[PDB]
Amino acid sequence: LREIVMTASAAIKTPQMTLPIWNDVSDEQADTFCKSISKVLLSEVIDKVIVTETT
DNA sequence: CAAGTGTGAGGAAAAGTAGTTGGGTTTTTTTTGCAGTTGAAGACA
Known part of the structure; x- marks a missing residue:
């Protein structure tokens, strides 16, 4: 309810x-x-x- | 042998006051959540 009413956040936490x-x-x-x-x-x-670093 | 003027100081004591100190307040002038935003570096036509 805070995510809607209070902040009108354009970034939902769980956008579906x-x-x-x-x-x-x-x-x-x-x-x-x-x-x-x-x-x-x-x-x-x-x-x-597998990384075989050879030098 | 003796009696008689003139007189300077020595002494005492309770309370005060000194010296030496201290006390004494007085008096004193380690991000732990949030969302936003600016300015920045960087980058582009």
Whole structure:
């Protein structure tokens, strides 16, 4: 309530956007779209990093 | 052997006052949350 009324902050702490999905949109299509929009960082795919510094 | 004028000081004491000190206040003139904002360096056409 403070984040709205008191500060009218243009930076919500947890900004969310709700998306209605068409009646025709399957649940499986919906999970595909959920994957399709979410961000994927390069870190998120790395398993191990080995640096062999030789000098 | 003796009696008789003139007279200077020595002495005492309670309270005060000295010396030496101190006390004594008096009197005294280690960010722990927040959101915003400016100015800055840097950068651009």
